[PDB]
Short mmCIF file of C-alpha atoms and ligand atoms in Angstrom, two decimals:
data_model
loop_
_atom_site.label_atom_id
_atom_site.label_comp_id
_atom_site.label_asym_id
_atom_site.label_seq_id
_atom_site.Cartn_x
_atom_site.Cartn_y
_atom_site.Cartn_z
CA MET A 397 -211.76 -98.87 -20.25
CA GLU A 398 -212.04 -95.14 -20.89
CA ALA A 399 -212.99 -92.96 -17.92
CA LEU A 400 -216.49 -91.66 -18.59
CA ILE A 401 -216.50 -88.67 -16.23
CA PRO A 402 -214.25 -86.62 -18.56
CA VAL A 403 -216.66 -87.41 -21.41
CA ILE A 404 -219.70 -86.06 -19.56
CA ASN A 405 -217.62 -83.05 -18.50
CA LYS A 406 -217.03 -82.26 -22.17
CA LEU A 407 -220.71 -82.77 -22.98
CA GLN A 408 -221.62 -80.33 -20.20
CA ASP A 409 -219.27 -77.79 -21.78
CA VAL A 410 -220.69 -78.46 -25.25
CA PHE A 411 -224.31 -77.76 -24.26
CA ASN A 412 -223.53 -74.72 -22.11
CA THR A 413 -225.28 -71.76 -23.76
CA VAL A 414 -227.38 -73.83 -26.15
CA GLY A 415 -229.65 -75.68 -23.74
CA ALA A 416 -228.57 -78.83 -21.91
CA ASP A 417 -231.90 -79.62 -20.24
CA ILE A 418 -233.34 -81.69 -23.10
CA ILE A 419 -230.17 -83.80 -23.15
CA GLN A 420 -230.87 -85.07 -19.62
CA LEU A 421 -227.19 -85.63 -18.82
CA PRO A 422 -226.10 -88.01 -16.04
CA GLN A 423 -224.88 -85.70 -13.28
CA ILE A 424 -225.02 -84.99 -9.56
CA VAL A 425 -227.07 -81.96 -8.53
CA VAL A 426 -226.36 -80.42 -5.14
CA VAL A 427 -229.43 -79.15 -3.29
CA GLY A 428 -228.88 -77.33 -0.02
CA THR A 429 -230.43 -74.60 2.07
CA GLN A 430 -229.02 -71.46 3.68
CA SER A 431 -226.72 -72.41 6.58
CA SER A 432 -226.72 -76.08 5.48
CA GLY A 433 -222.98 -76.07 4.75
CA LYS A 434 -223.14 -77.28 1.16
CA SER A 435 -220.50 -74.80 0.01
CA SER A 436 -218.27 -76.24 2.73
CA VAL A 437 -219.04 -79.75 1.47
CA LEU A 438 -217.78 -78.72 -1.97
CA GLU A 439 -214.66 -77.14 -0.46
CA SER A 440 -214.08 -80.30 1.59
CA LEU A 441 -214.04 -82.25 -1.67
CA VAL A 442 -211.75 -79.72 -3.35
CA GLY A 443 -209.36 -79.55 -0.40
CA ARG A 444 -209.21 -75.77 -0.70
CA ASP A 445 -211.55 -72.92 0.13
CA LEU A 446 -212.60 -71.44 -3.17
CA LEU A 447 -216.27 -70.53 -2.92
CA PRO A 448 -217.29 -66.90 -2.38
CA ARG A 449 -217.59 -66.14 1.23
CA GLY A 450 -220.43 -64.47 2.41
CA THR A 451 -221.64 -61.59 3.96
CA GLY A 452 -224.59 -61.61 2.87
CA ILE A 453 -226.60 -62.03 -0.01
CA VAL A 454 -224.87 -64.18 -2.66
CA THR A 455 -224.43 -67.04 -5.19
CA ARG A 456 -227.49 -66.91 -7.51
CA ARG A 457 -226.30 -68.94 -10.56
CA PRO A 458 -225.48 -72.63 -10.76
CA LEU A 459 -221.85 -73.73 -10.55
CA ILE A 460 -220.74 -76.83 -12.42
CA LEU A 461 -217.65 -77.87 -10.47
CA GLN A 462 -215.51 -80.38 -12.36
CA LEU A 463 -212.73 -81.91 -10.25
CA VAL A 464 -210.02 -83.45 -12.43
CA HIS A 465 -207.37 -85.64 -10.82
CA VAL A 466 -203.79 -85.17 -11.97
CA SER A 467 -200.52 -86.86 -11.03
CA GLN A 468 -198.32 -85.01 -8.53
CA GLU A 469 -195.73 -84.89 -11.32
CA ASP A 470 -198.24 -83.11 -13.54
CA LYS A 471 -197.82 -79.39 -12.90
CA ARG A 472 -198.18 -75.97 -14.56
CA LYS A 473 -195.88 -73.02 -15.14
CA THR A 474 -197.81 -70.34 -13.28
CA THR A 475 -199.23 -67.06 -14.65
CA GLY A 476 -196.53 -64.87 -16.03
CA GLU A 477 -195.98 -62.91 -12.84
CA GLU A 478 -192.17 -62.84 -13.29
CA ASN A 479 -191.60 -66.19 -11.53
CA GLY A 480 -191.91 -69.77 -12.77
CA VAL A 481 -192.39 -71.86 -9.65
CA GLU A 482 -194.29 -74.82 -10.94
CA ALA A 483 -197.86 -74.95 -9.64
CA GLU A 484 -199.47 -78.14 -8.32
CA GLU A 485 -203.12 -77.08 -8.63
CA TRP A 486 -204.90 -74.94 -11.21
CA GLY A 487 -208.33 -73.98 -12.54
CA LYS A 488 -210.03 -73.05 -15.81
CA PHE A 489 -213.32 -71.33 -16.58
CA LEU A 490 -215.22 -72.12 -19.77
CA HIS A 491 -216.15 -68.44 -20.04
CA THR A 492 -212.46 -67.47 -20.08
CA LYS A 493 -211.55 -70.47 -22.25
CA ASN A 494 -207.91 -71.56 -21.99
CA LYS A 495 -206.78 -69.03 -19.39
CA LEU A 496 -205.03 -70.61 -16.39
CA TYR A 497 -205.71 -69.83 -12.74
CA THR A 498 -202.95 -70.95 -10.38
CA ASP A 499 -204.18 -68.73 -7.54
CA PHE A 500 -207.36 -69.88 -5.88
CA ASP A 501 -208.05 -66.37 -4.74
CA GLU A 502 -208.29 -65.33 -8.38
CA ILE A 503 -210.49 -68.40 -8.85
CA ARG A 504 -212.76 -67.21 -6.04
CA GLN A 505 -212.71 -63.72 -7.53
CA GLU A 506 -213.62 -64.89 -11.04
CA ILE A 507 -216.59 -66.77 -9.58
CA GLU A 508 -217.70 -63.52 -7.94
CA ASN A 509 -217.00 -61.77 -11.26
CA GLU A 510 -219.16 -64.27 -13.15
CA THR A 511 -221.89 -64.20 -10.51
CA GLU A 512 -223.91 -61.31 -9.07
CA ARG A 513 -224.17 -59.51 -12.40
CA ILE A 514 -227.66 -58.61 -13.55
CA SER A 515 -226.63 -60.41 -16.74
CA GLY A 516 -228.76 -58.19 -18.95
CA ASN A 517 -232.02 -60.04 -18.43
CA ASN A 518 -234.61 -59.06 -15.86
CA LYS A 519 -234.22 -61.53 -13.03
CA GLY A 520 -232.48 -62.07 -9.73
CA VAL A 521 -231.64 -65.65 -10.63
CA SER A 522 -229.91 -66.93 -13.77
CA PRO A 523 -230.23 -70.57 -14.91
CA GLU A 524 -226.94 -70.39 -16.77
CA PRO A 525 -224.27 -72.37 -14.93
CA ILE A 526 -220.65 -71.39 -14.41
CA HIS A 527 -218.25 -74.07 -15.64
CA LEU A 528 -215.12 -74.49 -13.53
CA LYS A 529 -212.52 -77.25 -13.84
CA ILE A 530 -210.19 -77.88 -10.91
CA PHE A 531 -207.02 -79.83 -11.69
CA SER A 532 -205.40 -81.26 -8.55
CA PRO A 533 -203.58 -84.35 -7.22
CA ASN A 534 -205.61 -83.94 -4.03
CA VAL A 535 -209.06 -84.40 -5.58
CA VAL A 536 -210.92 -87.43 -6.88
CA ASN A 537 -212.52 -87.44 -10.32
CA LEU A 538 -215.92 -85.92 -9.57
CA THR A 539 -218.33 -83.38 -11.05
CA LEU A 540 -221.04 -81.56 -9.09
CA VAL A 541 -223.76 -79.15 -10.20
CA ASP A 542 -223.94 -76.72 -7.28
CA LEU A 543 -227.28 -74.91 -7.20
CA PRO A 544 -228.12 -71.64 -5.38
CA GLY A 545 -229.19 -72.31 -1.79
CA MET A 546 -232.75 -72.01 -0.50
CA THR A 547 -233.87 -70.26 2.66
CA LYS A 548 -233.99 -72.68 5.61
CA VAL A 549 -237.61 -71.73 6.26
CA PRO A 550 -240.52 -72.39 3.85
CA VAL A 551 -240.75 -69.80 1.05
CA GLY A 552 -243.93 -68.31 2.53
CA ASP A 553 -242.23 -67.80 5.89
CA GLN A 554 -239.76 -65.26 4.47
CA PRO A 555 -240.34 -61.87 2.81
CA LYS A 556 -238.58 -62.28 -0.55
CA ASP A 557 -240.60 -63.08 -3.61
CA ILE A 558 -237.44 -64.11 -5.40
CA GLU A 559 -237.27 -67.32 -3.40
CA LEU A 560 -239.96 -68.73 -5.70
CA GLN A 561 -237.73 -68.46 -8.76
CA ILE A 562 -234.95 -70.07 -6.74
CA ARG A 563 -237.26 -73.03 -6.11
CA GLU A 564 -238.18 -73.04 -9.81
CA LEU A 565 -234.50 -73.15 -10.77
CA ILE A 566 -233.76 -76.09 -8.49
CA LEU A 567 -236.86 -77.97 -9.64
CA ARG A 568 -235.81 -77.38 -13.25
CA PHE A 569 -232.45 -79.05 -12.60
CA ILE A 570 -233.55 -81.94 -10.38
CA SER A 571 -236.47 -82.87 -12.64
CA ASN A 572 -233.76 -84.32 -14.87
CA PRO A 573 -234.58 -88.06 -14.74
CA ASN A 574 -230.86 -88.85 -14.94
CA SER A 575 -229.83 -86.41 -12.23
CA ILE A 576 -228.68 -87.65 -8.84
CA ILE A 577 -229.84 -85.37 -6.04
CA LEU A 578 -227.26 -84.56 -3.38
CA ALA A 579 -229.42 -83.15 -0.58
CA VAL A 580 -227.44 -81.18 2.00
CA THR A 581 -228.86 -80.59 5.48
CA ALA A 582 -227.39 -79.73 8.88
CA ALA A 583 -227.60 -82.12 11.82
CA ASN A 584 -228.18 -78.89 13.73
CA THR A 585 -231.83 -78.87 12.64
CA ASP A 586 -235.02 -80.92 12.60
CA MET A 587 -233.78 -83.00 9.69
CA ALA A 588 -237.25 -84.28 8.74
CA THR A 589 -238.20 -80.69 7.88
CA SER A 590 -235.24 -79.87 5.66
CA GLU A 591 -236.31 -77.79 2.67
CA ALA A 592 -233.68 -79.67 0.66
CA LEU A 593 -235.26 -83.08 1.26
CA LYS A 594 -238.77 -81.70 0.76
CA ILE A 595 -238.16 -80.12 -2.60
CA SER A 596 -236.35 -83.30 -3.63
CA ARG A 597 -239.42 -85.40 -2.92
CA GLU A 598 -241.34 -83.26 -5.39
CA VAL A 599 -239.56 -84.91 -8.32
CA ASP A 600 -238.32 -87.96 -6.41
CA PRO A 601 -241.21 -88.72 -4.02
CA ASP A 602 -239.72 -91.84 -2.80
CA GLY A 603 -236.06 -90.87 -2.55
CA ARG A 604 -234.49 -93.31 -5.00
CA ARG A 605 -232.42 -90.66 -6.82
CA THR A 606 -231.36 -88.88 -3.65
CA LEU A 607 -228.30 -89.05 -1.40
CA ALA A 608 -228.41 -87.19 1.91
CA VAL A 609 -225.37 -85.40 3.31
CA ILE A 610 -225.54 -84.53 7.00
CA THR A 611 -223.26 -81.65 7.99
CA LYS A 612 -222.44 -79.91 11.27
CA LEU A 613 -222.28 -83.03 13.44
CA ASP A 614 -220.05 -81.08 15.83
CA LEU A 615 -222.76 -78.47 16.41
CA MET A 616 -225.62 -80.56 17.81
CA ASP A 617 -227.41 -79.94 21.12
CA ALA A 618 -226.11 -81.49 24.34
CA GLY A 619 -226.76 -85.22 24.39
CA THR A 620 -227.98 -85.70 20.91
CA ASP A 621 -226.21 -87.97 18.56
CA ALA A 622 -228.02 -88.43 15.28
CA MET A 623 -227.37 -92.10 15.27
CA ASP A 624 -230.82 -92.05 13.74
CA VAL A 625 -229.41 -89.66 11.14
CA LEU A 626 -226.52 -92.08 10.69
CA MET A 627 -228.97 -94.98 10.43
CA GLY A 628 -231.30 -93.50 7.90
CA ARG A 629 -234.07 -94.77 10.09
CA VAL A 630 -235.54 -91.28 9.76
CA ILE A 631 -234.72 -89.86 6.31
CA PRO A 632 -236.48 -91.66 3.41
CA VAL A 633 -233.50 -91.76 1.03
CA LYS A 634 -232.03 -94.61 -0.95
CA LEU A 635 -228.55 -93.71 -2.23
CA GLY A 636 -227.15 -93.32 1.28
CA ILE A 637 -226.80 -91.09 4.30
CA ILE A 638 -223.36 -89.61 4.79
CA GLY A 639 -222.46 -87.47 7.79
CA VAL A 640 -219.51 -85.08 7.66
CA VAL A 641 -217.85 -82.35 9.69
CA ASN A 642 -216.55 -79.53 7.52
CA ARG A 643 -214.27 -76.70 8.57
CA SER A 644 -216.03 -73.78 10.24
CA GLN A 645 -215.70 -70.11 9.30
CA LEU A 646 -213.52 -69.86 12.40
CA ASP A 647 -211.23 -72.51 10.93
CA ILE A 648 -210.93 -70.75 7.57
CA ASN A 649 -210.18 -67.36 9.14
CA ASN A 650 -207.67 -69.13 11.39
CA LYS A 651 -206.24 -70.81 8.31
CA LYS A 652 -206.85 -74.29 9.69
CA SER A 653 -204.74 -76.75 7.71
CA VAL A 654 -206.88 -79.21 5.76
CA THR A 655 -204.75 -82.07 6.90
CA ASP A 656 -205.60 -81.06 10.45
CA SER A 657 -209.30 -80.58 9.80
CA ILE A 658 -209.43 -84.00 8.11
CA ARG A 659 -208.08 -85.96 11.08
CA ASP A 660 -210.15 -83.82 13.46
CA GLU A 661 -213.26 -84.92 11.56
CA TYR A 662 -212.04 -88.52 11.61
CA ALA A 663 -211.26 -88.39 15.33
CA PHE A 664 -214.68 -86.87 16.03
CA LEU A 665 -216.32 -89.69 14.09
CA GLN A 666 -214.30 -92.35 15.84
CA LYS A 667 -215.30 -90.95 19.23
CA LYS A 668 -218.96 -90.20 18.66
CA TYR A 669 -219.94 -92.78 16.09
CA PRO A 670 -217.66 -95.76 16.35
CA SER A 671 -219.89 -98.39 14.75
CA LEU A 672 -220.58 -96.06 11.81
CA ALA A 673 -217.35 -94.07 11.40
CA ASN A 674 -216.08 -96.09 8.44
CA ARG A 675 -219.08 -95.14 6.29
CA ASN A 676 -219.01 -91.41 7.07
CA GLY A 677 -216.67 -88.45 6.68
CA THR A 678 -215.34 -86.25 3.89
CA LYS A 679 -212.93 -88.83 2.47
CA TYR A 680 -215.58 -91.56 2.39
CA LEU A 681 -218.07 -89.17 0.77
CA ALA A 682 -215.51 -88.33 -1.92
CA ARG A 683 -215.01 -92.02 -2.69
CA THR A 684 -218.64 -93.15 -2.89
CA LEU A 685 -219.61 -90.06 -4.90
CA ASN A 686 -216.86 -90.99 -7.36
CA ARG A 687 -217.97 -94.61 -7.64
CA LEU A 688 -221.63 -93.57 -7.78
CA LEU A 689 -221.08 -91.11 -10.62
CA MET A 690 -218.96 -93.59 -12.59
CA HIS A 691 -221.59 -96.32 -12.25
CA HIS A 692 -224.43 -93.92 -13.02
CA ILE A 693 -222.78 -92.60 -16.18
CA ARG A 694 -222.11 -96.06 -17.65
CA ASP A 695 -225.73 -96.93 -16.87
CA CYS A 696 -227.05 -93.89 -18.74
CA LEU A 697 -224.46 -93.91 -21.54
CA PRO A 698 -226.35 -96.14 -24.01
CA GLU A 699 -229.59 -94.12 -23.75
CA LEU A 700 -227.64 -90.86 -23.84
CA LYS A 701 -226.11 -91.81 -27.19
CA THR A 702 -229.41 -92.63 -28.90
CA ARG A 703 -231.12 -89.57 -27.41
CA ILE A 704 -228.49 -87.29 -28.94
CA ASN A 705 -229.17 -88.95 -32.30
CA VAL A 706 -232.96 -88.86 -31.85
CA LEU A 707 -232.76 -85.19 -30.84
CA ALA A 708 -230.60 -84.49 -33.89
CA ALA A 709 -233.09 -85.97 -36.35
CA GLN A 710 -235.97 -84.07 -34.74
CA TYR A 711 -234.20 -80.70 -34.76
CA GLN A 712 -233.19 -81.19 -38.40
CA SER A 713 -236.71 -82.06 -39.54
CA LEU A 714 -237.92 -79.12 -37.48
CA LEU A 715 -235.52 -76.92 -39.46
CA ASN A 716 -237.48 -78.01 -42.55
CA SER A 717 -240.74 -76.97 -40.96
CA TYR A 718 -239.39 -73.57 -40.21
CA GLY A 719 -237.23 -73.79 -43.31
CA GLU A 720 -236.33 -70.42 -44.83
CA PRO A 721 -235.76 -68.12 -46.30
CA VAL A 722 -232.39 -69.41 -47.48
CA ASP A 723 -231.25 -65.89 -46.61
CA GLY A 724 -227.76 -65.41 -45.19
CA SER A 725 -228.97 -63.30 -42.28
CA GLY A 726 -232.22 -62.60 -40.43
CA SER A 727 -233.34 -66.14 -41.21
CA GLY A 728 -234.94 -66.66 -37.83
CA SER A 729 -234.31 -66.62 -34.10
CA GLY A 730 -236.09 -69.95 -33.80
CA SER A 731 -234.22 -71.22 -36.84
CA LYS A 732 -230.99 -69.94 -35.27
CA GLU A 733 -231.68 -71.91 -32.10
CA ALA A 734 -232.22 -75.21 -33.94
CA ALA A 735 -229.07 -74.67 -36.00
CA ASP A 736 -227.01 -73.85 -32.91
CA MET A 737 -228.51 -76.87 -31.16
CA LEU A 738 -227.72 -79.12 -34.13
CA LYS A 739 -224.12 -77.91 -34.08
CA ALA A 740 -223.82 -78.74 -30.38
CA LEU A 741 -225.37 -82.17 -30.94
CA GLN A 742 -222.79 -82.73 -33.67
CA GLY A 743 -220.01 -82.00 -31.20
CA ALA A 744 -221.70 -84.30 -28.70
CA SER A 745 -221.86 -87.32 -31.01
CA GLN A 746 -218.25 -86.65 -32.02
CA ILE A 747 -217.16 -86.76 -28.37
CA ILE A 748 -219.17 -89.95 -27.85
CA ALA A 749 -217.76 -91.60 -30.99
CA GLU A 750 -214.24 -90.93 -29.71
CA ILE A 751 -214.75 -93.57 -27.01
CA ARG A 752 -213.78 -97.03 -28.16
CA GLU A 753 -212.74 -99.51 -25.66
CA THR A 754 -215.01 -102.57 -25.77
N1 GNP B 1681 -218.74 -76.40 12.67
C1 GNP B 1681 -219.15 -76.51 11.40
N2 GNP B 1681 -219.40 -75.42 10.69
C2 GNP B 1681 -219.80 -75.72 9.43
C3 GNP B 1681 -219.96 -76.96 8.85
N3 GNP B 1681 -220.38 -76.83 7.54
C4 GNP B 1681 -220.47 -75.55 7.35
N4 GNP B 1681 -220.13 -74.80 8.45
C5 GNP B 1681 -220.13 -73.35 8.57
O1 GNP B 1681 -221.46 -72.89 8.58
C6 GNP B 1681 -221.73 -72.09 7.41
C7 GNP B 1681 -222.51 -72.94 6.42
O2 GNP B 1681 -222.73 -72.25 5.19
P1 GNP B 1681 -221.90 -72.65 3.91
O3 GNP B 1681 -220.88 -73.64 4.34
O4 GNP B 1681 -221.41 -71.40 3.30
O5 GNP B 1681 -222.84 -73.37 2.96
P2 GNP B 1681 -224.11 -72.69 2.47
O6 GNP B 1681 -225.01 -72.59 3.64
O7 GNP B 1681 -224.58 -73.49 1.31
N5 GNP B 1681 -223.65 -71.30 1.86
P3 GNP B 1681 -224.12 -69.86 2.33
O8 GNP B 1681 -225.02 -70.00 3.54
O9 GNP B 1681 -222.85 -69.08 2.56
O10 GNP B 1681 -224.75 -69.17 1.14
C8 GNP B 1681 -220.38 -71.59 6.94
O11 GNP B 1681 -220.09 -70.32 7.51
C9 GNP B 1681 -219.39 -72.65 7.42
O12 GNP B 1681 -218.19 -72.08 7.91
C10 GNP B 1681 -219.69 -78.12 9.62
O13 GNP B 1681 -219.78 -79.30 9.27
N6 GNP B 1681 -219.28 -77.79 10.91
#
């Protein structure tokens, strides 16, 4: 049985600049607020810090993070750099094509380099995602669509008008019927007022497409345990409630080893939540997210295939409604879209046809 995650990864790449929304791809979309710790969740899954830091404003455009598992024997000759020590982990950006990044600091820098631009349109937020593959023996096969974080207070309770278009961007992504919403919220807050959960209920009223991740369990007030948060007595969400403890900024600056932060999280869970510890934590989260995505993709695969074909026939017949002038150039901008879309759909069906196992 062919692994389906790599297939959807390639489809994501195929529909990058051309418009992937109408495809309604099966994917996990990460919704979090400011100070929720969703960037840390991603880094917990990667096993490295790689996301741009901080201080402040930052991270406007979506990031499609594609974690690809490799064998520990599968390594890369690094850079040029006058060395040749074989590298165990590397990264690739779709914008830079086949270039290899063996230094995660150059990975973090390229993200900064691909973000924060004006981008030559008049906005503060761009809908165009960054595509980053991470090859590592320390990661599970998993892809996440990281969206720009919201303010932790309602949009009207803060002075920036731009927050609206941030909400629009998130809504645009999570309105995808085949998207799974990963809602990130800190245990440190009134969790039934999370902006992440609230905006998720706007497209998923009952939370049947939503999985809640509870971060910052180590930061709660004296003599609270969110056992209720562990229960999902309180949060109306169906795909699960998973509590984690990521590394703090203190830990990163101190260069806390990830092997040490992992067992520290585990030990914290064992102590504070003994009857629940086995269904919480970073490692657990990585495993159920992997299984969830695999099961979700195979569920959506048959409809995805026909939709690509249905879309193809529509765009082609639409090209015969536009349909001119037969000129080599200056044909149309709308005609150019449909042709570019048809080309991408062609690549999509090709990728899908290249699956075979029963
Ligand atoms: N103690 C502790 N600190 C955490 C945890 N998760 C995140 N943090 C810290 O609290 C902050 C959370 O923000 P971050 O992780 O960047 O995610 P974010 O809020 O989506 N991103 P940002 O606010 O930077 O735009 C970070 O400075 C991080 O170090 C956690 O589980 N425990």
